[PDB]
Amino acid sequence: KKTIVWFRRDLRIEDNPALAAAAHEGSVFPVFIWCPEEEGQFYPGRASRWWMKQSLAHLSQSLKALGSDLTLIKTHNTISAILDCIRVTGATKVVFNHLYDPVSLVRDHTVKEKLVERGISVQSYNGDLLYEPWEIYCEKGKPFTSFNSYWKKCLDMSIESVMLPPPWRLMPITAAAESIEELGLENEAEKPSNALLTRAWSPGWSNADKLLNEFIEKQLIDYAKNSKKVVGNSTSLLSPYLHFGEISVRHVFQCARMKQIIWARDKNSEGEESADLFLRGIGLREYSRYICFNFPFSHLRFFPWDADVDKFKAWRQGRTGYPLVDAGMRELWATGWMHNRIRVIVSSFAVKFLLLPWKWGMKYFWDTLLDADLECDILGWQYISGSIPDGHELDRLDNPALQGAKYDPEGEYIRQWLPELARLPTEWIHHPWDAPLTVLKASGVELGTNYAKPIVDIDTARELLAKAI
Amino acid sequence: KKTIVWFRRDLRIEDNPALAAAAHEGSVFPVFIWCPEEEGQFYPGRASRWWMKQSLAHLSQSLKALGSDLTLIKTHNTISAILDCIRVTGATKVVFNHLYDPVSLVRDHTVKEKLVERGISVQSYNGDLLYEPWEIYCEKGKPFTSFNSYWKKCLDMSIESVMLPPPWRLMPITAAAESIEELGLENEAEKPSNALLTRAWSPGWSNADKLLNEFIEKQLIDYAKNSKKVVGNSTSLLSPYLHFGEISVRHVFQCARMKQIIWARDKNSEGEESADLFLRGIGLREYSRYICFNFPFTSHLRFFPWDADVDKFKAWRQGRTGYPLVDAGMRELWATGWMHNRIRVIVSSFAVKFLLLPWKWGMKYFWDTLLDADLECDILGWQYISGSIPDGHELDRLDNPALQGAKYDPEGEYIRQWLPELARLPTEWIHHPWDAPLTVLKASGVELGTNYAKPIVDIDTARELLAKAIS
Amino acid sequence: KKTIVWFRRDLRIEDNPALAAAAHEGSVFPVFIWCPEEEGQFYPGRASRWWMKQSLAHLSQSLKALGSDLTLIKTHNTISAILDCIRVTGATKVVFNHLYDPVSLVRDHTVKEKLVERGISVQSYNGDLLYEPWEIYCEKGKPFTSFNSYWKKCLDMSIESVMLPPPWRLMPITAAAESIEELGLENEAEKPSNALLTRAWSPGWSNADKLLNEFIEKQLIDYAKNSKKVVGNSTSLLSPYLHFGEISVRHVFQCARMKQIIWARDKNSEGEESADLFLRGIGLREYSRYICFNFPFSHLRFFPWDADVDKFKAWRQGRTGYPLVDAGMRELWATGWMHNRIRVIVSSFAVKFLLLPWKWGMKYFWDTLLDADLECDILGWQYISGSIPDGHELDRLDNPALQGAKYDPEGEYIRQWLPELARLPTEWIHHPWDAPLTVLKASGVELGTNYAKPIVDIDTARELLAKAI
Amino acid sequence: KKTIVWFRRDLRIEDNPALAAAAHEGSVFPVFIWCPEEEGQFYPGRASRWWMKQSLAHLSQSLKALGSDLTLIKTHNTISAILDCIRVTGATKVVFNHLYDPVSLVRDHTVKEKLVERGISVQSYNGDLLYEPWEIYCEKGKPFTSFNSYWKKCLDMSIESVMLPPPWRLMPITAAAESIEELGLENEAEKPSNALLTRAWSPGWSNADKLLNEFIEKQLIDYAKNSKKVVGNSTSLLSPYLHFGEISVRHVFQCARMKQIIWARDKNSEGEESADLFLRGIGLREYSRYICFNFPFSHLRFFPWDADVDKFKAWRQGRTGYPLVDAGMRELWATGWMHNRIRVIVSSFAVKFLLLPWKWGMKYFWDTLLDADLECDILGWQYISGSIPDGHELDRLDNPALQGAKYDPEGEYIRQWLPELARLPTEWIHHPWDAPLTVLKASGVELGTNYAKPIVDIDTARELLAKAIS
Ligand SMILES: Cc1cc2nc3c(=O)[nH]c(=O)nc-3n(C[C@H](O)[C@H](O)[C@H](O)COP(=O)(O)OP(=O)(O)OC[C@H]3O[C@@H](n4cnc5c(N)ncnc54)[C@H](O)[C@@H]3O)c2cc1C
Ligand SMILES: Cc1cc2nc3c(=O)[nH]c(=O)nc-3n(C[C@H](O)[C@H](O)[C@H](O)COP(=O)(O)OP(=O)(O)OC[C@H]3O[C@@H](n4cnc5c(N)ncnc54)[C@H](O)[C@@H]3O)c2cc1C
Ligand SMILES: Cc1cc2nc3c(=O)[nH]c(=O)nc-3n(C[C@H](O)[C@H](O)[C@H](O)COP(=O)(O)OP(=O)(O)OC[C@H]3O[C@@H](n4cnc5c(N)ncnc54)[C@H](O)[C@@H]3O)c2cc1C
């Protein structure tokens, strides 16, 4: 047999069912079709493309040792490149993994019909998901918009398997079509600025496996009390690796459940909730693929926004005057990642405080986030605008005085990303516009020149939001 | 559908095909039927029974945290106990894993025939092996008889898979049948002495996975450089955990295979070589079940006039033979229930070629003392030492303890730990004090014949008493 | 014998000559006279006073466990308080250590003259200093105007022992006089802002002993290669404890000297150089007291200034547009300490770029430095203004491009204290105004809104100095 | 000036009063005069001489790094070698540190008189003790009888200090006196066996400052609860280093003293008690040189012994059937060191259970111990003998069933030095003879085959000694 594997966002060799199907039957021809025209509005952002350039290099380096290597093709049409690979490789079967974004859903089915009619067999295995969105029903069949009612039933009867990495790898003697090597992801006018994200990130499937041993045996023990704290990479940093499919979610769920069974047996209650807080976070990634599968284009709510370009640039540069918002936008753009509670605040500020279009705030998240996912990002904005009964309503404006006192105690997250407020005490570190002048100047801050004043008064933004509902 | 899971030597949940097959179809019913009379001359030993008692107690607490308890059963007939569990729970399928011991080889295929007549569904799975002995074929007849030619063909193709542990399980209902209250595995007079085995061993599958993680990440880096030595944690110390099936062979194999792949793209020239020896070490266990399958007795039927000396037999157990590697090996074997591989090639070659003692005498001692008392490994180990297999050693091959210790134990640090009386004896004579001059022996406070015993047998006599005893 | 141990800036118990001589004689009455009126402009600043309140509280409970409590007195005249402590205790002798500042020099000699005439014996010992300035002279009595010829001579002689803390203690047990528990150091208008210095500093003498045992066996090995690094606290962080006398320099020298002898015969060509740069640095504290002794006020090289108050606020708040200067002024305000290389840059920028009075720059250093030392700070400004033969010429300015490449490699000091310059490459991390406009957006740095433009051009400031000399 | 330094038992530089004073006055000419014929009975043993050789070359290496060598001299008369060094060097003052052995007490003072009559300046400093034995005066004239009352007197003054190492060194011109390159400390027959002491000891003043800092900062907080134990590094292993004067007694005292002050205000509870035991442990060394100073050569009893040469070989090589005694003898000979609580067990077993002459035990402890202190080893045997008031009477001995139940619980100390008793339960581990026959067959213990039977009954030693105490 001659099989052609099609890597998309399953950039790994471990537990790859499409790759395990190959190399178990005949020869393998790895290929990566990169068609930017067919991506549409879902084109990968600036930082998301940088992770793709490094992961594909780490992938091609991995496949180069197994026996074959990793063909990259930039084409104007995916089917035009797939049918052209079969021309030079003489393959009789093509295999790939599942992707549930709106562009790949209609493309996986179109690629099927075009070459299955031609006597060439296809097969699409389960990838990046523990449960397919067509494997669960409420007995009846109603969709569980309730994540609580969703994940409560997913914990019942797991029936899958964990695969292996292929020991060997065979490749036919072929030619080339239309081939490329490495271009179309990083712009020369910003490569030096993009080469600085390596300070806190290292793309690759093997580096992802090092992270699992760094988090399971050492950091998952007290994850329930660290995830609440926002200052420190307190969580697992597995979002960029899981999006690009560098870690199989089977492994992320198996070894985490393995720790839960040991802690549930050792009477340990601190680790039990730590495993619950992490496994029920893994289910949210599965919940995002379930909603986006039967609720694509939910969020059909177009109320009078306030398309102010200048007020949007201050939200990107962290000049909104709010400490917890400006620090989050400072962390997002410095490391390409931010905590979940930070995203909740900086996104709510973009729609509830500034009335900017939610698409504008998402297009910036889609561009600068290293973990820029499609199902998870949309799911986060639905949690903000009030599209799920298990999320905060659009009308509420959380007071930063108590909001910072929950996720960022002692104000150590602002004093790390906003060094100008390093002497402002924790009593006013989340809201300098409430402290008297006798303690503001004592802290060294001068609201106006030393630190930006609040861009929008919260007292006037509460009623003005309810003034249009 | 109610399904009875029959635990035997697969005391684990991570990759248990029989346990994963059940608990997914419907209900589950764990049971450990302990029938000592059906196991003949190779009834589980003394220390190995102690390990089994602690693992079963840990297995009981592990399963009770998932959903169902564990039915500990000690009856007079195993098949009678299986038929008793079917009627009390209403089960319809009996599921267990594969075992290749001659006792279970003839009764596992008997339980199937007994239950097919009654209509009870049965299905066996490969639990503690990656290549079953009937899966490797050729185009001719017989196996390979050489491990090099056997393991060369196993590395050609590979189709494995790792199963997941179920987070939920369901008990059946009503009354229980004959139930054993965890009894028989220990004798009242030798219980405090068996508790001393906890100093270097913590049985159970939970500590088994942590050791596999510790060895792969922090010790497989230089396994090829330490496995050839004896001192300290030279190897992985996974034999007692792999014998009772607490870690699946695939989980141990793939962890060193995954680490070997990363040690290739990073051009770790000596890294992937360390995984080659460890994986081939696992292959020796695979090759043990191939010989034991085709040759199902206990290529080893050479019993000639032995020196049935019970006085020289107790001097070999307690480690008082004048040979440091032999004495220190028998000192660690009885104090920790374990010993290095190269030392087992020494203490047993000394038992059959230096003392002319029966090989069944030393093998019965390994059965009671070794926690990793593997039937398939304890047979292949003694066959490799004698001239039974052309895999390595012959019958008329003796090794000088001088070049033997300096090859597997430099600086003599292994003897000084288990023989304090030879602490100030230099490494040049630490492995053979009799060949050292009296000017250094008294300076090293040895004094043969009072503190450390003189060599019980001469190296030249054992060669002249054996070459003239073969015809 | 009833003795009075006048604690001043010797806030320790171990290696205390005046405390040991008074203990091994008879009774001990420790007292601390705090007269802010006798202090001229050398009155302790905001940060330096906070360190005094913590060390004195630690000193109070320290002696409280040995046998005698600590007495703090805030009076109008020090001699009036000393005469009061004598008439309430009957102490026939008053002992103290040495202080070489101009105010405390004429005071100790006035205290001796006023107490000797009353029949009360006085005794002074060497404290907080290896060898006094009146003990180092060649065959000629010429004071060493150069430091290279200074410390090279201090190593050719060594005669000073080290003593242990007193074992026992007892009190003359008599009524007290005017007993000012704790007044003057901290005002309530800035108490919470001052309490935030506990993040990176823990004042006390036992914490100083905790600091040495960590710096010797762990950080002194490669001190020569870490002193060239500005990022982080690469040095020892011993200046605050040495200024307040919380640990004697004899123990600081003896621990580093024996480590050098250990590395001497060990063929350690890297440990000797590390012990050298630390001991040569200890000599700078020794050299500061030498110039402060027979050179009262040289630093009288004044030149016309441009005292711009608005340009002085930007120098404090770090709004000067220079990344290496603003990052240092942020660290000076956040933690009250900065590296020696940073102090050279931020002080030269105040006098050589903005043309601000050197006293104004010192008035801010003296107020915000936890290690605010009179002899060390003046010696620092003498090194910048060009008042030393082996210093820096006042007529020349260093290019921040090559300046950052010398003391801040990899560019990690700006990315920590100025998070807006995170993705700005090292090629322009020290000077964003030289970078092209194409990379100023790739680095997400808009000068008019993100990080302010340089307030004064470098080439103009270099010629403006030559325009008035 | 030019001063000659005489290193004898002060092989250190951190705090050496005779070395730092000689460095300031002028030139430094370090000499190490040995002369075994003047030692006689107090000649260092086999293992103790090995430490002296390794610590000598290491101290000679550290001296040359400063600027002055170390002249090693082996002579027949120590005074003839001192005068030979003065003429070839031209020195004026001869300096050295104090010692408190009967040899040096009459030798150093003889050096003083013969060099004073010739016009050579001499000055001896204190560098081996906190308070010198003549600085303490008690009652009216009885030099105190016990230690618990002696050390209370030392805790009522304390005018100590410490000194710094001198970075400068300069040796004069020509010399070449009657110095040898290597003496006769090691014999070729016992050299490879002596090299096996490096695995447990790294002698020298440089390493001495390492485990000193390691002990005070790490394993001192819980010294009050680990001093009674024996397993592992229970104590500080500072006995051999303080014997050769590689660490100043003031630095050892003032380090644990500084931790007690910090643990006082913080109220560490166990911290103050651990210092109160370690400092009073140093006080026993202070009392060792005190009782040995006023008394010559309280330990002179020649009652009928049992001079059995075969019973001496069993107690020496650890074959007496007593695991707590046999394991100690196998440690004392393997590592050249043993815990203090083991010494009162292996030495009391030799003089009471076996009735062997105590000189046979003291001669063996002098050869195999690296910390062979003349002033301290004698006091240890006096504690075993019925001599010291606060000590063991001659007719007292404890059952090992209670010794291990308090000083060595869990029996992990025996299973390391006696592997043949590993599976023996921790109850009968210190006395296998009293164990039932079922546990002995189960624990592989065959008293008389693999492990030796008790060489002497405990009830016999009590009844045999009663007839001799009349
Ligand atoms: C507005 C908004 C936008 C978001 N955009 C993304 C995105 O683009 N990509 C992304 O991976 N996550 C996104 N999330 C989820 C969340 O920000 C990250 O999953 C998490 O904060 C970082 O992962 P971690 O490994 O550090 O933490 P952990 O909590 O340890 O991550 C657990 C894993 O489970 C999944 N997961 C965790 N939380 C969620 C969630 N809320 N929704 C979906 N899956 C989840 C991810 O695979 C994640 O790696 C978004 C959340 C919000 C509120
Ligand atoms: C006379 C004799 C008797 C032996 N009896 C046993 C026995 O009863 N039980 C037992 O498990 N091993 C036995 N062996 C093999 C060998 O002693 C052990 O495998 C090894 O010493 C312990 O392996 P480890 O887990 O400590 O380390 P590693 O060697 O790192 O473990 C590798 C694993 O592979 C297998 N393995 C490794 N070497 C061999 C080998 N030579 N033969 C077979 N399998 C091997 C084992 O499952 C082992 O756990 C015997 C060898 C000899 C010479
Ligand atoms: C403008 C300016 C102002 C300064 N103001 C002070 C001050 O107020 N207080 C202060 O203690 N030091 C001052 N210094 C000296 C120097 O900044 C600090 O000694 C040092 O940076 C503190 O870090 P450290 O103690 O970890 O350094 P290390 O080098 O690790 O410590 C060496 C020690 O030696 C002394 N020392 C080292 N370098 C110098 C130096 N250049 N001048 C004087 N003493 C030195 C200090 O006691 C210091 O603690 C100043 C230097 C300059 C250029």
Numbering used by the authors:
A (entry chain B), C (entry chain A): 5 to 182, 188 to 306, 314 to 485
B (entry chain C): 5 to 182, 188 to 307, 314 to 486
D (entry chain D): 5 to 182, 188 to 306, 314 to 486
Article passage:
CRYs are comprised of two core domains: the highly conserved N-terminal photolyase homologous region (PHR) and the diversified carboxy-terminal extension (CCE). The chromophore, flavin adenine dinucleotide (FAD), is non-covalently bound to the C-terminal α subdomain of the PHR and plays a critical role in facilitating photoreduction. The CCE domain plays role in the regulation of CRYs by interacting with constitutive photomorphogenesis 1 (COP1) ubiquitin ligase as part of light signaling pathway.
AtCRY2-PHRtetramer is comprised of four monomeric units (A, B, C, D) that are arranged as a ring-like structure with a central hollow cavity. The architecture within tetrameric AtCRY2-PHR is comprised of two different interfaces: a head to tail (H–T interface, monomers A–B) and head to head (H–H interface, monomers A–D) interaction between the monomers. In the AtCRY2-PHRtetramer, the interface (H–T) is assembled by the residues from α6, α12, α13, α18, α19, 310, L-24, L-26 and the second interface (H–H) is formed by the residues from α2, α10, α7, and L-11. The co-factor, FAD, adopts a typical U-shaped conformation and is buried inside the central core of C-terminal α domain, similar to the conformation reported in other structures of cryptochromes and photolysases. Similarly, Q333 residue (monomer A) forms ionic interactions with E462 (monomer B), and bifurcated hydrogen bond interactions with T465 and N466 (monomer B). In AtCRY2-PHRinactive the α1 helix of BIC2 is inserted straight in the middle of the H-T interface and clearly clashes with the residues in α18, α19, and L-26, thus preventing or disrupting the H–T interface and oligomerization of AtCRY2.
